[PDB]
Subunit: 115 residues, 4 copies
Protein backbone atom coordinates (compact mmCIF):
# COMPACT_ATOMS: atom_id res chain seq x y z
CA UNK A 1 0.00 0.00 0.00
CA UNK A 2 2.15 2.88 -1.35
CA UNK A 3 -0.46 5.61 -0.81
CA UNK A 4 -2.55 6.10 2.33
CA UNK A 5 -4.89 8.94 3.25
CA UNK A 6 -5.98 9.90 6.77
CA UNK A 7 -8.60 12.59 7.47
CA UNK A 8 -9.24 14.24 10.86
CA UNK A 9 -11.96 16.57 12.18
CA UNK A 10 -10.59 19.59 14.11
CA UNK A 11 -13.99 20.63 15.44
CA UNK A 12 -15.08 17.26 16.86
CA UNK A 13 -11.67 15.82 17.76
CA UNK A 14 -12.22 12.59 15.84
CA UNK A 15 -11.46 10.90 12.53
CA UNK A 16 -13.50 12.20 9.59
CA UNK A 17 -15.71 9.20 8.84
CA UNK A 18 -17.34 8.28 5.53
CA UNK A 19 -15.88 11.23 3.62
CA UNK A 20 -15.35 10.99 -0.15
CA UNK A 21 -11.72 11.26 -1.30
CA UNK A 22 -10.58 11.45 -4.94
CA UNK A 23 -7.10 11.02 -6.35
CA UNK A 24 -6.24 12.29 -9.83
CA UNK A 25 -3.09 12.00 -11.96
CA UNK A 26 -2.03 14.75 -14.37
CA UNK A 27 -1.95 13.86 -18.07
CA UNK A 28 0.28 15.18 -20.88
CA UNK A 29 -2.38 17.71 -21.88
CA UNK A 30 -2.44 18.93 -18.27
CA UNK A 31 -5.88 17.38 -17.76
CA UNK A 32 -6.65 15.70 -14.44
CA UNK A 33 -7.50 12.03 -15.00
CA UNK A 34 -9.21 9.94 -12.29
CA UNK A 35 -6.74 7.57 -10.59
CA UNK A 36 -8.34 6.12 -7.42
CA UNK A 37 -11.00 7.04 -4.86
CA UNK A 38 -13.06 5.84 -1.91
CA UNK A 39 -14.71 6.81 1.37
CA UNK A 40 -12.86 7.03 4.68
CA UNK A 41 -13.36 4.27 7.24
CA UNK A 42 -14.32 4.54 10.91
CA UNK A 43 -10.68 5.39 11.64
CA UNK A 44 -10.75 8.13 9.02
CA UNK A 45 -8.44 6.14 6.78
CA UNK A 46 -8.49 4.94 3.20
CA UNK A 47 -6.40 1.87 2.38
CA UNK A 48 -6.09 -0.14 -0.81
CA UNK A 49 -6.25 2.97 -2.99
CA UNK A 50 -3.55 1.70 -5.33
CA UNK A 51 -0.69 -0.76 -5.80
CA UNK A 52 3.07 -0.42 -6.08
CA UNK A 53 2.89 -1.33 -9.77
CA UNK A 54 0.22 1.28 -10.54
CA UNK A 55 1.61 4.20 -8.48
CA UNK A 56 4.31 5.55 -10.82
CA UNK A 57 6.08 8.93 -10.72
CA UNK A 58 4.01 11.93 -11.74
CA UNK A 59 1.85 14.76 -10.39
CA UNK A 60 -1.13 13.71 -8.27
CA UNK A 61 -4.00 15.59 -6.65
CA UNK A 62 -5.93 14.47 -3.57
CA UNK A 63 -9.32 16.19 -3.32
CA UNK A 64 -11.49 15.84 -0.23
CA UNK A 65 -15.18 16.42 -0.89
CA UNK A 66 -17.22 16.83 2.29
CA UNK A 67 -21.00 17.02 1.94
CA UNK A 68 -23.28 18.13 4.77
CA UNK A 69 -20.30 17.32 6.97
CA UNK A 70 -20.39 20.32 9.30
CA UNK A 71 -24.18 20.61 9.64
CA UNK A 72 -23.69 23.65 11.86
CA UNK A 73 -23.71 27.46 11.84
CA UNK A 74 -21.83 29.28 9.10
CA UNK A 75 -22.84 32.66 7.69
CA UNK A 76 -21.29 32.80 4.21
CA UNK A 77 -20.71 28.99 4.05
CA UNK A 78 -17.20 28.37 2.76
CA UNK A 79 -17.88 24.94 1.21
CA UNK A 80 -14.16 24.28 1.52
CA UNK A 81 -12.38 21.65 -0.55
CA UNK A 82 -8.91 20.49 0.47
CA UNK A 83 -6.82 20.13 -2.70
CA UNK A 84 -3.42 18.54 -2.10
CA UNK A 85 -1.17 18.51 -5.20
CA UNK A 86 2.22 16.76 -5.08
CA UNK A 87 4.80 14.96 -7.21
CA UNK A 88 5.47 11.28 -6.53
CA UNK A 89 9.25 10.86 -6.61
CA UNK A 90 11.06 7.51 -6.82
CA UNK A 91 14.32 8.90 -5.40
CA UNK A 92 12.80 9.07 -1.92
CA UNK A 93 10.99 6.75 0.55
CA UNK A 94 8.37 4.44 -0.97
CA UNK A 95 5.40 4.77 1.40
CA UNK A 96 3.29 7.95 1.30
CA UNK A 97 0.75 9.00 3.92
CA UNK A 98 -1.27 12.14 3.18
CA UNK A 99 -2.90 13.51 6.33
CA UNK A 100 -5.58 16.23 6.35
CA UNK A 101 -7.09 18.17 9.29
CA UNK A 102 -10.41 19.87 8.51
CA UNK A 103 -12.26 22.93 9.86
CA UNK A 104 -15.08 25.03 8.27
CA UNK A 105 -12.81 27.87 7.09
CA UNK A 106 -9.41 26.18 7.26
CA UNK A 107 -7.46 22.99 6.64
CA UNK A 108 -3.95 21.71 7.18
CA UNK A 109 -2.19 18.86 5.43
CA UNK A 110 1.08 17.03 5.98
CA UNK A 111 2.97 14.36 4.08
CA UNK A 112 4.76 11.55 5.89
CA UNK A 113 7.08 9.67 3.52
CA UNK A 114 8.74 6.51 4.87
CA UNK A 115 10.16 3.08 3.98
CA UNK B 1 -9.92 45.34 -1.62
CA UNK B 2 -12.29 42.32 -1.47
CA UNK B 3 -9.66 39.57 -1.91
CA UNK B 4 -6.24 39.55 -0.27
CA UNK B 5 -3.64 36.83 0.34
CA UNK B 6 -1.04 36.66 3.13
CA UNK B 7 1.69 34.01 3.27
CA UNK B 8 4.07 33.06 6.10
CA UNK B 9 7.19 30.84 6.17
CA UNK B 10 7.35 28.48 9.20
CA UNK B 11 10.97 27.46 8.63
CA UNK B 12 12.42 30.98 8.62
CA UNK B 13 9.81 32.68 10.81
CA UNK B 14 9.10 35.42 8.29
CA UNK B 15 6.67 36.56 5.63
CA UNK B 16 6.93 34.56 2.38
CA UNK B 17 8.15 37.12 -0.17
CA UNK B 18 7.65 37.11 -3.95
CA UNK B 19 5.38 34.08 -3.94
CA UNK B 20 3.28 33.69 -7.10
CA UNK B 21 -0.47 33.34 -6.56
CA UNK B 22 -3.11 32.34 -9.15
CA UNK B 23 -6.87 32.64 -8.69
CA UNK B 24 -9.43 30.83 -10.87
CA UNK B 25 -13.23 30.83 -11.02
CA UNK B 26 -15.27 27.79 -12.05
CA UNK B 27 -17.16 28.30 -15.32
CA UNK B 28 -20.56 27.00 -16.42
CA UNK B 29 -18.97 24.13 -18.36
CA UNK B 30 -17.16 23.04 -15.18
CA UNK B 31 -13.74 24.27 -16.36
CA UNK B 32 -11.50 26.65 -14.40
CA UNK B 33 -11.32 30.15 -15.87
CA UNK B 34 -8.41 32.48 -14.99
CA UNK B 35 -9.57 35.26 -12.65
CA UNK B 36 -6.53 37.09 -11.25
CA UNK B 37 -2.90 36.63 -10.25
CA UNK B 38 0.06 38.37 -8.63
CA UNK B 39 3.03 38.05 -6.26
CA UNK B 40 3.39 38.71 -2.52
CA UNK B 41 5.23 41.82 -1.30
CA UNK B 42 8.04 42.14 1.25
CA UNK B 43 5.37 41.90 3.95
CA UNK B 44 4.13 38.64 2.46
CA UNK B 45 0.89 40.27 1.32
CA UNK B 46 -0.87 40.48 -2.03
CA UNK B 47 -3.41 43.28 -2.54
CA UNK B 48 -5.22 44.64 -5.59
CA UNK B 49 -6.10 41.30 -7.18
CA UNK B 50 -9.63 42.35 -8.07
CA UNK B 51 -12.41 44.88 -7.50
CA UNK B 52 -15.83 44.67 -5.87
CA UNK B 53 -17.48 44.71 -9.31
CA UNK B 54 -15.35 41.92 -10.76
CA UNK B 55 -15.48 39.66 -7.67
CA UNK B 56 -18.88 38.09 -8.26
CA UNK B 57 -20.51 35.09 -6.58
CA UNK B 58 -18.92 31.77 -7.51
CA UNK B 59 -16.56 28.89 -6.78
CA UNK B 60 -12.94 30.05 -6.63
CA UNK B 61 -9.60 28.27 -6.50
CA UNK B 62 -6.58 29.94 -4.97
CA UNK B 63 -3.26 28.34 -5.93
CA UNK B 64 -0.09 29.46 -4.12
CA UNK B 65 3.01 28.29 -5.98
CA UNK B 66 5.01 26.92 -3.08
CA UNK B 67 7.32 24.62 -5.07
CA UNK B 68 8.93 27.59 -6.83
CA UNK B 69 9.26 29.43 -3.50
CA UNK B 70 11.01 26.57 -1.68
CA UNK B 71 13.22 25.74 -4.66
CA UNK B 72 14.32 29.37 -4.93
CA UNK B 73 15.57 28.97 -1.35
CA UNK B 74 17.40 25.71 -2.04
CA UNK B 75 14.82 23.35 -0.57
CA UNK B 76 13.22 20.27 -2.14
CA UNK B 77 9.48 20.54 -1.22
CA UNK B 78 6.82 17.85 -1.32
CA UNK B 79 3.84 19.75 -2.77
CA UNK B 80 3.49 21.45 -6.15
CA UNK B 81 1.53 24.21 -4.44
CA UNK B 82 -0.87 25.07 -1.62
CA UNK B 83 -4.42 25.07 -2.94
CA UNK B 84 -7.92 25.71 -1.63
CA UNK B 85 -11.33 25.75 -3.31
CA UNK B 86 -14.25 27.67 -1.80
CA UNK B 87 -17.50 29.49 -2.54
CA UNK B 88 -17.41 33.30 -2.29
CA UNK B 89 -20.04 36.03 -1.94
CA UNK B 90 -22.89 33.52 -1.69
CA UNK B 91 -24.52 35.58 1.09
CA UNK B 92 -23.74 38.95 -0.45
CA UNK B 93 -20.42 40.79 -1.00
CA UNK B 94 -17.73 40.13 1.63
CA UNK B 95 -14.02 40.87 2.10
CA UNK B 96 -11.80 37.77 2.03
CA UNK B 97 -8.27 37.24 3.30
CA UNK B 98 -6.69 33.86 2.56
CA UNK B 99 -3.85 33.26 5.06
CA UNK B 100 -1.34 30.47 4.39
CA UNK B 101 1.45 28.99 6.56
CA UNK B 102 4.17 27.03 4.75
CA UNK B 103 6.68 24.26 5.55
CA UNK B 104 8.43 21.93 3.07
CA UNK B 105 6.13 18.92 3.73
CA UNK B 106 3.05 20.64 5.17
CA UNK B 107 0.86 23.73 4.87
CA UNK B 108 -2.35 25.27 6.14
CA UNK B 109 -4.78 27.76 4.61
CA UNK B 110 -7.41 29.75 6.50
CA UNK B 111 -10.01 32.28 5.40
CA UNK B 112 -10.94 35.45 7.28
CA UNK B 113 -14.28 36.71 6.00
CA UNK B 114 -15.60 40.13 7.03
CA UNK B 115 -18.35 42.58 6.06
CA UNK C 1 5.98 47.47 19.45
CA UNK C 2 8.39 44.50 19.87
CA UNK C 3 5.80 41.86 20.84
CA UNK C 4 2.38 41.48 19.24
CA UNK C 5 -0.18 38.67 19.16
CA UNK C 6 -2.78 37.93 16.46
CA UNK C 7 -5.47 35.27 16.83
CA UNK C 8 -7.84 33.77 14.23
CA UNK C 9 -10.93 31.54 14.59
CA UNK C 10 -11.05 28.64 12.07
CA UNK C 11 -14.67 27.70 12.83
CA UNK C 12 -16.15 31.14 12.17
CA UNK C 13 -13.57 32.42 9.69
CA UNK C 14 -12.89 35.60 11.63
CA UNK C 15 -10.49 37.26 14.03
CA UNK C 16 -10.72 35.91 17.61
CA UNK C 17 -11.97 38.90 19.62
CA UNK C 18 -11.48 39.61 23.33
CA UNK C 19 -9.17 36.66 23.90
CA UNK C 20 -7.07 36.91 27.07
CA UNK C 21 -3.31 36.51 26.60
CA UNK C 22 -0.67 36.06 29.33
CA UNK C 23 3.09 36.31 28.82
CA UNK C 24 5.67 34.99 31.30
CA UNK C 25 9.47 35.06 31.44
CA UNK C 26 11.55 32.30 33.03
CA UNK C 27 13.42 33.45 36.14
CA UNK C 28 16.84 32.42 37.46
CA UNK C 29 15.29 29.96 39.92
CA UNK C 30 13.49 28.26 37.01
CA UNK C 31 10.05 29.65 37.93
CA UNK C 32 7.79 31.58 35.56
CA UNK C 33 7.56 35.29 36.33
CA UNK C 34 4.62 37.38 35.03
CA UNK C 35 5.75 39.68 32.20
CA UNK C 36 2.69 41.16 30.48
CA UNK C 37 -0.94 40.47 29.60
CA UNK C 38 -3.91 41.84 27.67
CA UNK C 39 -6.88 41.03 25.41
CA UNK C 40 -7.24 40.96 21.61
CA UNK C 41 -9.12 43.76 19.83
CA UNK C 42 -11.93 43.55 17.27
CA UNK C 43 -9.25 42.84 14.66
CA UNK C 44 -7.97 39.93 16.74
CA UNK C 45 -4.76 41.79 17.54
CA UNK C 46 -3.00 42.67 20.80
CA UNK C 47 -0.50 45.54 20.75
CA UNK C 48 1.29 47.48 23.49
CA UNK C 49 2.21 44.51 25.68
CA UNK C 50 5.73 45.76 26.35
CA UNK C 51 8.47 48.17 25.31
CA UNK C 52 11.89 47.70 23.74
CA UNK C 53 13.54 48.42 27.11
CA UNK C 54 11.44 45.93 29.06
CA UNK C 55 11.61 43.12 26.47
CA UNK C 56 15.03 41.73 27.34
CA UNK C 57 16.70 38.50 26.26
CA UNK C 58 15.15 35.39 27.81
CA UNK C 59 12.82 32.39 27.64
CA UNK C 60 9.20 33.46 27.28
CA UNK C 61 5.88 31.64 27.50
CA UNK C 62 2.83 32.95 25.68
CA UNK C 63 -0.47 31.52 26.93
CA UNK C 64 -3.64 32.23 24.95
CA UNK C 65 -6.73 31.40 27.00
CA UNK C 66 -8.71 29.48 24.42
CA UNK C 67 -10.99 27.57 26.81
CA UNK C 68 -12.64 30.80 27.97
CA UNK C 69 -12.99 31.96 24.35
CA UNK C 70 -14.70 28.79 23.12
CA UNK C 71 -16.91 28.51 26.20
CA UNK C 72 -18.05 32.12 25.78
CA UNK C 73 -19.30 31.03 22.34
CA UNK C 74 -21.09 27.94 23.64
CA UNK C 75 -18.47 25.36 22.64
CA UNK C 76 -16.83 22.66 24.77
CA UNK C 77 -13.10 22.80 23.82
CA UNK C 78 -10.40 20.21 24.42
CA UNK C 79 -7.45 22.40 25.47
CA UNK C 80 -7.13 24.71 28.47
CA UNK C 81 -5.19 27.12 26.26
CA UNK C 82 -2.81 27.45 23.32
CA UNK C 83 0.74 27.75 24.62
CA UNK C 84 4.24 28.18 23.21
CA UNK C 85 7.64 28.58 24.84
CA UNK C 86 10.54 30.22 22.99
CA UNK C 87 13.77 32.18 23.37
CA UNK C 88 13.63 35.87 22.40
CA UNK C 89 16.22 38.52 21.52
CA UNK C 90 19.11 36.05 21.75
CA UNK C 91 20.72 37.56 18.64
CA UNK C 92 19.89 41.16 19.51
CA UNK C 93 16.54 43.02 19.69
CA UNK C 94 13.86 41.84 17.25
CA UNK C 95 10.15 42.42 16.64
CA UNK C 96 7.96 39.37 17.31
CA UNK C 97 4.44 38.56 16.17
CA UNK C 98 2.90 35.36 17.54
CA UNK C 99 0.08 34.26 15.21
CA UNK C 100 -2.40 31.62 16.39
CA UNK C 101 -5.16 29.72 14.55
CA UNK C 102 -7.86 28.11 16.71
CA UNK C 103 -10.34 25.20 16.45
CA UNK C 104 -12.06 23.36 19.33
CA UNK C 105 -9.72 20.31 19.25
CA UNK C 106 -6.66 21.77 17.51
CA UNK C 107 -4.51 24.89 17.21
CA UNK C 108 -1.32 26.19 15.67
CA UNK C 109 1.08 28.97 16.69
CA UNK C 110 3.69 30.59 14.46
CA UNK C 111 6.25 33.31 15.05
CA UNK C 112 7.14 36.07 12.60
CA UNK C 113 10.47 37.60 13.61
CA UNK C 114 11.74 40.78 11.95
CA UNK C 115 14.46 43.40 12.42
CA UNK D 1 -3.35 2.53 26.52
CA UNK D 2 -5.54 5.59 27.29
CA UNK D 3 -2.96 8.20 26.24
CA UNK D 4 -0.88 8.11 23.07
CA UNK D 5 1.43 10.75 21.61
CA UNK D 6 2.51 11.03 17.97
CA UNK D 7 5.09 13.57 16.78
CA UNK D 8 5.72 14.55 13.13
CA UNK D 9 8.41 16.63 11.39
CA UNK D 10 7.01 19.20 8.92
CA UNK D 11 10.40 20.01 7.41
CA UNK D 12 11.53 16.45 6.66
CA UNK D 13 8.13 14.82 6.05
CA UNK D 14 8.72 12.02 8.55
CA UNK D 15 7.98 10.98 12.13
CA UNK D 16 10.00 12.85 14.76
CA UNK D 17 12.25 10.07 16.07
CA UNK D 18 13.89 9.83 19.48
CA UNK D 19 12.39 13.07 20.80
CA UNK D 20 11.85 13.55 24.55
CA UNK D 21 8.22 13.98 25.63
CA UNK D 22 7.08 14.85 29.17
CA UNK D 23 3.60 14.65 30.64
CA UNK D 24 2.72 16.55 33.82
CA UNK D 25 -0.43 16.63 35.97
CA UNK D 26 -1.52 19.78 37.81
CA UNK D 27 -1.60 19.61 41.61
CA UNK D 28 -3.85 21.40 44.12
CA UNK D 29 -1.23 24.12 44.61
CA UNK D 30 -1.17 24.63 40.84
CA UNK D 31 2.28 23.05 40.63
CA UNK D 32 3.08 20.78 37.69
CA UNK D 33 3.98 17.30 38.94
CA UNK D 34 5.72 14.75 36.67
CA UNK D 35 3.28 12.06 35.47
CA UNK D 36 4.90 10.06 32.62
CA UNK D 37 7.55 10.50 29.93
CA UNK D 38 9.63 8.79 27.26
CA UNK D 39 11.27 9.14 23.86
CA UNK D 40 9.42 8.70 20.57
CA UNK D 41 9.96 5.51 18.58
CA UNK D 42 10.92 5.09 14.92
CA UNK D 43 7.27 5.73 14.06
CA UNK D 44 7.30 8.93 16.10
CA UNK D 45 5.01 7.37 18.68
CA UNK D 46 5.08 6.88 22.42
CA UNK D 47 3.03 4.00 23.81
CA UNK D 48 2.74 2.63 27.33
CA UNK D 49 2.86 6.10 28.88
CA UNK D 50 0.17 5.26 31.42
CA UNK D 51 -2.66 2.90 32.36
CA UNK D 52 -6.42 3.24 32.57
CA UNK D 53 -6.23 3.05 36.37
CA UNK D 54 -3.60 5.79 36.62
CA UNK D 55 -5.02 8.25 34.05
CA UNK D 56 -7.75 9.98 36.08
CA UNK D 57 -9.56 13.26 35.35
CA UNK D 58 -7.52 16.43 35.77
CA UNK D 59 -5.40 18.97 33.91
CA UNK D 60 -2.41 17.57 32.02
CA UNK D 61 0.44 19.15 30.07
CA UNK D 62 2.39 17.49 27.25
CA UNK D 63 5.75 19.17 26.68
CA UNK D 64 7.94 18.26 23.71
CA UNK D 65 11.62 19.01 24.24
CA UNK D 66 13.65 18.84 21.04
CA UNK D 67 17.43 19.14 21.34
CA UNK D 68 19.70 19.72 18.35
CA UNK D 69 16.73 18.46 16.35
CA UNK D 70 16.79 20.97 13.49
CA UNK D 71 20.57 21.23 13.10
CA UNK D 72 20.04 23.79 10.33
CA UNK D 73 20.02 27.53 9.63
CA UNK D 74 18.12 29.82 11.97
CA UNK D 75 19.08 33.41 12.72
CA UNK D 76 17.53 34.19 16.10
CA UNK D 77 16.99 30.48 16.99
CA UNK D 78 13.49 30.07 18.38
CA UNK D 79 14.21 27.01 20.55
CA UNK D 80 10.50 26.26 20.38
CA UNK D 81 8.75 24.04 22.92
CA UNK D 82 5.30 22.67 22.14
CA UNK D 83 3.21 22.89 25.32
CA UNK D 84 -0.17 21.17 25.05
CA UNK D 85 -2.42 21.70 28.09
CA UNK D 86 -5.79 19.92 28.31
CA UNK D 87 -8.35 18.53 30.75
CA UNK D 88 -8.98 14.78 30.78
CA UNK D 89 -12.75 14.33 30.95
CA UNK D 90 -14.52 11.06 31.80
CA UNK D 91 -17.79 12.11 30.14
CA UNK D 92 -16.27 11.64 26.69
CA UNK D 93 -14.42 8.91 24.70
CA UNK D 94 -11.78 6.97 26.64
CA UNK D 95 -8.81 6.88 24.24
CA UNK D 96 -6.74 10.04 23.73
CA UNK D 97 -4.21 10.61 20.95
CA UNK D 98 -2.24 13.86 21.08
CA UNK D 99 -0.61 14.62 17.72
CA UNK D 100 2.03 17.32 17.19
CA UNK D 101 3.52 18.68 13.93
CA UNK D 102 6.82 20.54 14.36
CA UNK D 103 8.63 23.32 12.45
CA UNK D 104 11.42 25.71 13.60
CA UNK D 105 9.10 28.70 14.23
CA UNK D 106 5.73 26.96 14.38
CA UNK D 107 3.83 23.92 15.61
CA UNK D 108 0.33 22.52 15.32
CA UNK D 109 -1.40 20.04 17.58
CA UNK D 110 -4.64 18.09 17.40
CA UNK D 111 -6.50 15.81 19.78
CA UNK D 112 -8.26 12.68 18.54
CA UNK D 113 -10.55 11.26 21.23
CA UNK D 114 -12.17 7.88 20.51
CA UNK D 115 -13.54 4.67 22.04
Amino acid sequence: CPLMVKVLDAVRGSPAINVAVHVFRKAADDTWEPFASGKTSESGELHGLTTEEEFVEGIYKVEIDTKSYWKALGSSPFHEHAEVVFTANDSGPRRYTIAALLSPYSYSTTAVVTN
